[PDB]
C-alpha cells in the first residue's frame, strides 16, 4: 500500500537531480499521501523533467511560469496585442527573431507522427503575424522515443515509472477507476492484430453480418452444383436468339475493320487520298512546321557575361538603365571603329532594350544632376562599384577589359550612337525528309524555347530575345512573358519573318540534342518492312509518311495526339486477331481540333491502308511489329499533365460518376446517423439483387451464381474589372463549407498520449472513421486515381492487404507480386502461342469503382476455413477491418469544390451541365458537400491485394463453369486488373470447325462475369496469334521488342542531381533498353546526347562520368565497373598495359595464401601517392613514376561532396517537372559549387582555367580533358589554391577497379583485348563507422570488394547489385554479337 509511496519519497530527493525548478514540485509530491494525488504529482514531475531537460538541451529557456507567447513578447517591452494562445516548452528571444520550442515523447510511431504534424502546424500558423510584427520564427520540435533526461538516470526513470504503474493498478482496484482514460495512462507510454481493444459491436454489425448470409446456401453438394450450372446456361442460350444482345462479340473481316476505320469522323476528315496532297497539307498545318522545313541560307559576346554576373544581387527599375549604358557604350566602339536586332542593344537579362529609350533615359537622369563634364560621374563610378564586386567571391580577370571600352564615350558621339543604325513568307519546301536538316532545326528551335524558362523577373522593344544558334547563321525569339506558363513567341531573321506561334517550353525537352537518334530510329523501322508486296513505289511513300508523322508529333505535342496514336495498338491487334468486341470503334474515336490533330489521323489511316492493304498475310509478322512500334511511338510526347485544375476536375468526375447511379450520402457524421443506416440498408439490398438478365454494366452480384461459387469452394472440388467582382461573388464558399474536418491538459504533450485506439465499434476504431483523400497520378493515356490517407489508417489497411496476400499465397494462379509466378506465366503463354491455341487476352473494365469491400466481406464470412483460436479468430479481425473500410470517407478536393461553386454562382446569377454538377446545385441550395461515403469504392490500389485474391478465385470458378458445360478446363492468370485465358486444343479446333459456338463461349464467359462484379472491356480480343499480359506482347515464337518504348524513356528523366549519379540512372536505363532489342548504335547515341547535355552545362568531363561511347553489345556480362574500366583502358592506351599485369600478379598472390590484411596496409590510404610505387616494388618489375604521376584527372568531389561518410554507408543508410530540373542543374553547377579543405567554396571556372593555363601543366583533350598530363610527383609549390590537391592519379583508380572487377565477374577481366545484410556485416568488420550506421537501424572475398568500394566513392561494384535490380534474360541482335572484344 504505502510502501511504494515511501519508496518514491526516498527516491525523489535522493536519486534525482536537485534543481530549483524540480524542488517546488518535489516537495509537494513527497508531502502528499492520497493515491490519486500521488499519481498526479508523479506524472507532473515526470513531465517537467523532460520539459526542462529538452528545453536546456536545445538551449531554449524553459517556460516554468507558464508564460504565454504574448507574455514572452511583452516582457521584452514589445506590444503585440492579439495572438493565438500557446505555451511553448522553450523560448529564445533575440533582437529580431523568436524561437518557440515544443517537446513531446510518444511510443507508438503513429501517434508520434500525428503529434509531429499537429505541432508543426501549430507553430507555423503564427508565422505571418510574427513576420509582420518585425520578428521571425525558428521552428524546432523535440520528439523523443524515450524518457531519458539529465535530471534522472536510466534506472531512476525506469523504476519510477514502474512504481507509478503498480500504484496505478492498485488505484484502479479502488474507486479511482477511469473508463478509458485509465487505458491511455497504463497501456500507453507505460502491429500484428492488436486485440487489446474492447468490443462495442451491437445492432449494426448484425444488419451487415446478416445480409452476408441471407439467400446464400454455402454448402451445396458436389453434384447439386453441376445441376445448378446446367440450369443457368440453357436458360441463357435459350434467351440469346431474341432476348439481350448478340454477345457484343463478332468475328473480324480485316477489310471491314479497315473500312470502318477509314469512315470514322464522317464530318470533316473525308478521305484525302493521294500522298503528295497529304504531305502538302502536313507541311502547312501548324505555324511551326512551316519553318522547320523552309530551306533558308569575340570582344563582345563576353562583356555580357560580366555585366550579367553582377545582376542577381540586386534588381531595381532605377537600376538596369545605367546597367545598360555600360552596354550601349560598347556598341559604339566596335562598329564606329568599323548582335543588334534593329532597336536592340541586348542588355543583361536576355533583355532587349531600344536604342532610343536609352540615350533618352540619360539627358534627364543626367540633366537632373557642363553636360560633357556631366558624364564620367556615372560611367566611371558605376565601373568602380561593379568592380566593387571584385575578388569578393573571386571577381575574375574581366575587370580591366571594359576600362577601355566604357570611358571611350563622349557627347558629340553619344548624340548619334543610336542614330547611326536606324533601320527598325518563306514557304514549306516539302521535299525535305530523309533530311537531317529538318529535324536538326527542331533540335535547335527547342533548345531556344527550352532555355527560356530560365529567364527571370526583370520587372515598344521589351522582349526577351533568346538566340537560335545553328551552323553559322542565327535567328532569334521574341516574347514577353517568362516563368513556365504559355506565351506567344516569334522568330526573326534578316528580314522580319514573324512566324508567330503559341507553345509551352516544358513540353519540349525530347529533341534538345537528338538529331542522329531520331533519324536513325525512323530509319531502323523502315528496315523491318522490306516486304515484298511493298517493293513497288510504296516504300518511299511510307517513309515520307512516317517522317512527316514524327515531325508532327514532336512539333505539335498535346494530349489528343498521344491518346490517338496510343489507340492504334488495339486496332492492329484486332486486325491480326480473330475475335473482337463489337463496340470497338467507339473506343477509338476522339474529338479532333487544330488541323495538325486531323492530319495525324489522315496519316494514320493512309499508313494502315498501305501496310494492311492487299496481298496481306504474306509477311504479317513484320507488318505487325512495324505497326505496334508505331503505336508505341506515342511516348515521344511528355507525360506532364497539361493543366492542374482541369485535370483534378476530371479525376473527381471519374470517381463520382458511378456513385451518381448507385448512392452516395454526402458528408457522413462521426457517429453513423439513422439516415446512413437506412441508405446502407438500401444499398446492401440492391447490391445482392441482380436478376439473371442484368443491365450488363451496373454494380451488383447475383445471389444465385454467387451461392454456387462459394459452395463450390467450401466443398472440396475447386482446389489443387470582371475578374475581381466575379471572384468575390464566388468567394461565398466561406459562407457555406464548414463541414468540420479534469484530464491532464498540460501533460497532454507529456507521457499521456491523447488519441489512441480504445473500444472500437463496427464503424470506426474510436479515433476516427478511416478518412482518406484523393488525387490523380500521372500517366500517358489517362490520369489514374490515387487514394492517400494519414498514417494510422495507412497502418490499419496494411493488416488486410497483408492477410489477403498471405492467404492467396496458398493458391497458385495469381501473379501480381509473386514474381516467381510471372516467369511461369511467360513460359506457359509462350508454349501456348507457339502452337496456335486461342488466348482470350481479356482486360477488365471499371475495376476501381465496381468493387466494394462489402463483396470481400460476403466472400470471407462465407468460406469455411479450419479450426478455432487461430482461424475462428483472426478472420474476425479482417472481417472487422473490412467493415471499417466499408464506411470510409473520401474528401472532395478543395479546388474541385471551389470550381463547382464558382460555376454554380455564375450560372445562377446569369445549358450543358454535367451530371456531377447538378448534385452540387441541389446541395448548395442547402449544405455544401465535403465528404462522400458509399459501398462501391475499393480505393484504387488500397486493397489491390484483396481484389487480386477475389479475382483469382472468381477466375478459378468461371473456368470451371465453362469446363462443365463445354467440356474443357482453360487455365488462367491474373494481375488484379488484366488476365489471360489459354484455351486448350479442343476449344481451338472449334473456332475453325464452328465459330458460332466459340462465339457463345465468349458470350457466356462475359455473362457470368456480369453476374459477379467483373465486366469485360471492349478492348479485349481472342487471337490465335498475339498475347498481351502486362504489356508484354507476343507473336508466333519471339516477342515484339518495343524499341520506341525504351528510347522514349531513356531520353526523358535527366533529373537534377550530382552528375556522377545522373549518369548512373542513365547507365541503368540503357541496360534496361539493351535487354530488349534497341540496337547498340542507338544506345551510344542516347549516351552521347546525355554527355552533350552536361557539356552544355559547362561541367568538365572526367573519365568516370558516363560510360564508354564505343560499345560492343557487351552490356551483357559487365557491370558499371566494366564500362568504366574499358573506358580508362582506351583513354590512356599504353600506360594501362603494365598496371594490368601488376593487377594480374596481385590477384595471383592474394587469393590463395598471401595478403588479405597487409594489402590494406599497402592500400596505404593513410598517406599520399607513392603507394603505387611501393606496391610495384613489392612484387613486380620496373614501374616508373610516369604511369603514376603523369595521368591524373581533375576530381571535383575529392575532399567534400559538391553542394546543391562514404558512399556505400549512405546507401545502406538509405535502407531504413523534368525540364525544370535541368534548367536548375545548369544553374547550380556553374556557380560556387566545389568545396575546399576548409569548407570554402570556389567556382569551376576559376579552378578549371588555372589548372591548364597558369601552371606548367599540360592539359590537352581526347574528348574529355585529362588535365595535367604530368603533375610530376606533384613536386610543386603544392596546394596553390586547390587545383593541385584536388586531382587524383588515374592509373591507381584503374587498379582498384580492375581488381574489384576480378573477384566479382571473373578472371578474364584482366587479359589482353550478396545482399544488404551481408554488406552491413562486412562493413561492421571494421567498427569505426558502426557508431553512425547502427543507431539508424530502428563470404569468400567480400571483405576485399567492400573495402575497395568504400574508398572509391564515385563508383559502384558492390553497392550496385543492392541498389538497382538487374535483368535475367536478354534478346540481342546477331549483328552486334559478331563485333565483340
Amino acid at each position: 500500500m504505502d510502501e511504494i509511496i515511501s519508496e518514491l519519497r526516498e527516491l525523489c530527493l535522493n536519486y534525482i537531480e536537485q534543481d530549483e525548478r524540480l524542488s517546488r514540485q518535489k516537495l509537494n509530491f513527497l508531502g502528499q499521501r492520497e493515491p490519486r494525488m500521488v499519481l498526479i504529482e508523479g506524472l507532473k514531475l515526470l513531465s517537467r523533467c523532460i520539459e526542462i531537460d529538452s528545453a536546456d538541451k536545445s538551449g531554449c529557456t524553459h517556460n516554468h511560469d507558464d508564460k504565454s507567447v504574448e507574455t514572452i513578447l511583452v516582457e521584452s517591452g514589445i506590444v503585440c496585442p492579439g495572438l493565438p494562445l500557446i505555451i511553448p516548452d522553450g523560448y529564445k528571444l533575440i533582437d529580431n527573431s523568436l524561437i518557440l520550442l515544443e517537446c513531446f515523447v510518444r511510443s507508438t510511431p503513429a501517434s508520434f507522427e500525428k503529434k509531429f504534424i499537429e505541432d508543426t502546424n501549430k507553430l507555423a500558423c503564427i508565422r505571418e503575424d510574427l513576420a509582420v510584427a518585425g520578428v521571425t520564427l525558428v521552428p524546432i520540435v523535440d520528439g523523443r522515443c524515450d524518457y531519458d533526461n539529465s535530471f534522472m538516470p536510466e534506472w531512476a526513470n525506469f523504476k519510477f515509472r514502474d512504481l507509478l504503474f503498480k500504484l496505478l493498478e492498485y488505484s484502479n482496484q479502488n474507486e479511482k477507476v477511469f473508463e478509458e482514460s485509465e487505458y491511455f495512462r497504463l497501456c500507453e507510454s507505460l502491429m500484428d492484430s492488436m486485440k487489446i481493444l474492447k468490443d462495442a459491436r451491437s445492432t449494426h454489425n448484425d444488419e451487415i453480418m446478416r445480409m452476408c448470409h441471407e439467400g446464400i446456401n454455402p454448402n451445396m453438394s458436389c453434384d447439386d452444383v453441376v445441376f445448378g450450372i446446367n440450369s443457368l446456361f440453357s436458360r441463357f442460350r435459350r434467351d440469346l436468339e431474341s432476348g439481350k444482345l448478340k454477345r457484343n462479340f463478332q468475328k473480324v473481316n480485316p477489310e471491314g475493320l479497315i473500312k470502318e476505320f477509314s469512315e470514322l469522323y464522317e464530318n470533316l476528315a473525308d478521305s484525302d487520298d493521294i500522298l503528295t496532297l497529304s504531305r502538302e497539307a502536313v507541311e502547312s498545318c501548324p505555324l511551326m512546321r512551316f519553318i522547320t522545313a523552309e530551306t533558308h541560307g569575340t570582344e563582345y559576346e563576353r562583356l555580357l557575361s560580366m555585366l550579367n554576373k553582377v545582376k542577381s544581387l540586386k534588381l531595381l527599375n532605377t537600376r538596369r538603365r545605367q546597367l545598360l549604358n555600360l552596354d550601349v557604350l560598347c556598341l559604339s566602339s566596335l562598329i564606329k571603329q568599323s548582335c543588334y536586332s534593329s532597336v536592340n542593344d541586348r542588355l543583361v537579362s536576355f533583355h532587349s532594350t531600344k536604342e532610343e529609350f536609352i540615350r533618352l533615359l540619360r539627358n534627364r537622369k543626367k540633366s537632373k544632376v557642363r553636360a560633357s563634364i556631366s558624364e564620367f560621374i556615372a560611367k566611371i563610378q558605376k565601373c568602380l562599384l561593379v568592380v566593387g564586386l571584385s575578388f569578393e567571391h573571386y571577381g575574375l580577370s574581366e575587370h580591366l577589359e571594359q576600362e577601355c571600352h566604357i570611358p571611350f564615350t563622349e557627347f558629340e558621339n553619344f548624340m548619334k550612337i543610336g542614330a547611326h543604325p536606324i533601320m527598325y513568307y518563306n514557304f514549306q519546301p516539302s521535299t525535305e525528309q530523309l533530311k537531317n536538316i529538318q529535324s536538326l532545326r527542331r533540335l535547335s528551335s527547342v533548345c531556344l524555347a527550352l532555355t527560356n524558362s530560365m529567364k527571370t523577373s526583370s520587372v515598344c522593344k521589351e522582349v526577351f530575345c533568346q538566340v537560335i544558334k545553328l551552323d553559322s547563321e542565327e535567328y532569334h525569339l521574341l516574347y514577353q512573358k517568362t516563368g513556365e506558363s504559355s506565351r506567344c513567341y516569334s522568330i526573326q531573321g534578316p528580314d522580319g519573318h514573324l512566324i508567330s506561334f503559341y507553345a509551352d517550353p516544358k513540353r519540349f525537352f525530347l529533341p534538345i540534342f537528338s538529331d542522329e537518334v531520331l533519324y536513325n530510329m525512323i530509319d531502323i523501322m523502315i528496315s523491318w518492312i522490306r516486304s515484298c508486296p511493298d517493293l513497288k513505289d510504296c516504300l518511299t511513300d511510307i517513309e515520307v509518311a512516317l517522317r512527316t508523322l514524327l515531325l508532327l508529333m514532336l512539333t505539335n505535342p498535346t494530349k489528343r495526339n498521344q491518346k490517338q496514336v496510343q489507340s492504334v495498338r488495339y486496332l492492329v491487334m484486332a486486325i491480326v486477331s480473330d475475335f473482337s468486341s463489337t463496340s470497338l470503334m467507339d473506343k477509338l474515336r476522339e474529338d479532333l481540333i487544330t488541323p495538325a490533330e486531323k492530319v495525324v489521323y489522315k496519316l494514320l489511316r493512309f499508313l494502315i491502308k498501305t501496310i494492311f492493304g492487299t496481298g496481306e498475310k504474306v509477311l504479317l509478322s513484320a507488318k505487325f511489329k512495324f505497326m505496334l512500334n508505331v503505336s508505341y511511338l506515342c511516348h515521344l510526347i511528355t507525360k506532364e499533365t497539361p493543366d492542374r485544375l482541369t485535370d483534378q476536375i476530371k479525376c473527381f468526375e471519374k470517381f463520382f460518376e458511378p456513385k451518381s447511379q448507385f448512392g452516395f450520402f454526402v458528408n457522413p457524421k462521426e457517429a453513423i446517423t439513422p439516415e446512413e443506416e437506412c441508405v446502407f440498408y438500401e444499398q446492401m439490398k440492391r447490391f445482392t439483387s441482380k436478376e439473371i438478365d442484368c443491365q450488363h454494366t451496373t454494380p451488383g452480384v447475383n445471389l444465385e451464381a454467387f451461392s454456387l461459387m462459394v459452395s463450390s469452394f467450401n466443398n472440396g472440388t475447386l482446389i489443387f474589372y470582371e475578374y475581381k467582382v466575379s471572384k468575390l461573388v464566388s468567394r461565398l464558399v466561406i459562407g457555406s463549407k464548414g463541414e468540420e474536418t479534469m484530464s491532464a491538459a498540460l501533460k497532454n504533450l507529456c507521457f499521456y498520449s491523447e488519441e489512441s485506439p480504445t473500444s472500437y465499434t463496427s464503424v470506426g476504431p474510436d479515433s476516427g472513421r478511416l478518412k482518406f483523400a484523393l488525387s490523380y497520378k500521372e500517366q500517358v493515356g489517362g490520369n489514374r486515381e490515387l487514394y492517400i490517407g494519414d498514417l494510422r489508417t495507412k497502418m490499419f489497411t496494411r493488416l488486410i492487404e497483408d492477410y489477403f496476400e498471405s492467404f492467396s499465397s496458398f493458391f497458385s494462379g495469381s501473379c501480381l507480386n509473386n514474381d516467381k509466378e510471372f516467369e511461369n506465366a511467360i513460359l506457359s503463354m509462350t508454349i501456348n502461342v507457339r502452337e496456335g491455341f486461342l488466348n482470350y487476352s481479356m482486360d477488365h473494365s471499371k475495376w476501381g469503382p465496381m468493387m466494394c469491400p462489402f463483396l470481400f466481406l460476403m466472400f470471407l464470412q462465407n468460406l469455411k476455413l479450419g479450426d478455432d483460436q487461430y482461424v475462428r479468430s483472426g478472420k474476425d479481425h479482417v472481417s472487422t477491418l473490412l467493415t471499417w473500410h466499408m464506411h470510409k470517407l473520401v474528401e472532395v478536393p478543395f479546388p474541385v469544390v471551389n470550381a463547382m461553386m464558382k460555376s454554380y454562382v455564375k450560372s445562377k446569377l446569369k445549358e450543358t451541365t454535367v451530371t456531377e454538377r447538378i448534385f452540387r446545385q441541389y446541395f448548395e441550395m442547402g449544405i455544401v458537400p465535403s465528404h462522400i461515403s458509399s459501398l462501391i469504392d475499393m480505393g484504387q490500389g488500397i486493397l489491390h491485394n484483396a481484389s487480386d485474391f477475389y479475382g483469382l478465385l472468381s477466375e478459378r470458378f468461371i473456368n470451371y463453369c465453362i469446363g462443365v458445360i463445354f467440356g474443357e478446363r482453360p487455365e488462367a492468370y491474373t494481375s488484379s486488373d488484366d488476365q489471360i485465358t489459354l484455351f486448350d486444343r479442343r476449344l481451338s479446333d472449334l473456332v475453325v470447325s464452328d465459330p458460332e459456338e466459340v462465339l457463345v463461349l465468349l458470350e457466356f464467359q462475359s455473362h457470368l462475369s456480369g453476374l459477379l462484379n467483373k465486366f469485360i472491356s471492349p478492348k479485349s480480343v481472342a487471337g490465335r496469334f498475339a498475347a498481351e499480359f502486362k504489356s508484354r506482347f507476343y507473336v508466333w515464337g519471339e516477342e515484339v521488342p518495343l524499341l520506341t518504348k525504351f528510347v522514349s524513356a531513356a531520353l526523358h528523366n535527366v533529373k537534377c542531381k550530382e552528375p556522377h549519379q545522373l549518369c548512373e540512372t542513365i547507365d541503368t536505363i540503357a541496360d534496361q533498353a539493351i535487354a530488349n532489342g534497341v540496337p547498340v548504335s542507338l544506345v551510344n547515341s542516347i549516351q552521347r546526347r546525355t554527355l552533350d547535355l552536361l557539356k552544355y552545362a559547362n561541367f568538365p568531363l572526367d573519365p568516370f562520368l558516363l560510360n564508354t561511347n564505343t560499345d560492343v553489345k557487351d552490356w551483357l556480362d559487365g557491370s558499371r565497373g566494366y564500362r568504366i574500366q574499358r573506358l580508362i583502358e582506351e583513354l590512356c592506351p599504353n600506360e594501362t598495359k603494365v598496371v594490368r599485369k601488376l593487377v594480374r600478379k596481385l590477384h595471383h598472390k592474394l587469393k590463395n595464401g598471401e595478403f588479405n590484411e597487409e594489402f590494406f596496409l599497402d592500400l596505404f590510404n593513410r598517406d599520399k601517392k607513392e603507394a603505387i610505387l611501393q606496391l610495384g616494388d613489392l612484387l613486380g618489375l620496373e614501374e616508373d613514376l610516369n604511369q603514376l604521376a603523369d595521368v591524373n584527372w581533375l576530381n571535383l568531389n575529392e575532399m567534400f561532396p559538391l553542394r546543391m561518410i562514404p558512399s556505400l554507408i549512405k546507401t545502406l543508410q538509405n535502407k531504413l517537372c523534368i525540364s525544370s530540373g535541368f534548367i536548375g542543374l545548369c544553374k547550380t553547377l556553374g556557380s560556387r559549387c566545389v568545396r575546399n579543405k576548409n569548407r570554402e567554396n570556389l567556382y569551376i571556372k576559376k579552378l578549371l582555367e588555372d589548372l591548364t593555363t597558369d601552371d606548367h601543366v599540360t592539359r590537352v583533350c581526347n574528348r574529355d580533358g585529362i588535365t595535367l598530363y604530368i603533375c610530376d610527383k606533384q613536386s610543386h609549390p603544392e596546394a596553390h589554391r586547390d587545383h593541385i590537391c584536388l586531382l587524383r592519379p588515374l592509373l591507381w583508380d584503374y587498379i582498384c577497379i580492375s581488381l574489384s572487377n576480378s573477384f566479382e565477374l571473373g578472371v578474364w577481366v584482366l587479359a589482353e583485348p550478396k545482399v544488404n545484410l551481408n554488406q552491413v556485416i562486412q562493413s561492421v568488420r571494421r567498427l569505426y563507422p558502426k557508431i553512425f550506421e547502427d543507431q539508424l537501424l530502428p563470404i569468400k572475398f567480400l571483405d576485399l570488394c567492400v573495402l575497395i568500394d568504400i574508398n572509391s566513392e564515385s563508383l559502384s561494384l558492390i553497392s550496385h547489385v543492392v541498389k538497382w535490380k538487374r535483368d535475367e534474360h536478354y534478346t540481342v541482335l546477331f549483328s552486334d554479337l559478331a563485333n565483340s572484344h
Partner: protein, 48 residues
C-alpha cells in the same frame, strides 16, 4: 517442324512447303523469291 501454317501467311491451314525452320506456301514463296535470296524470316536461304 513445329506449327502447321505459313509462318508468314498467319493463315492458310495446310497446303504449304517446308522451309529450313517454318512453313511457306506455293505463294508466299513466290512473293519473297521475287525480291531477295534470304529467308527474311529464318535468316537462311529460301527454298527452291
Amino acid at each position: 517442324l513445329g506449327p502447321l501454317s505459313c509462318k508468314s501467311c498467319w493463315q492458310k491451314f495446310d497446303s504449304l512447303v517446308r522451309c529450313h525452320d517454318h512453313y511457306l506456301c506455293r505463294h508466299c514463296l513466290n512473293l519473297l523469291l521475287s525480291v531477295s535470296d534470304r529467308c527474311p524470316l529464318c535468316k537462311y536461304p529460301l527454298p527452291t
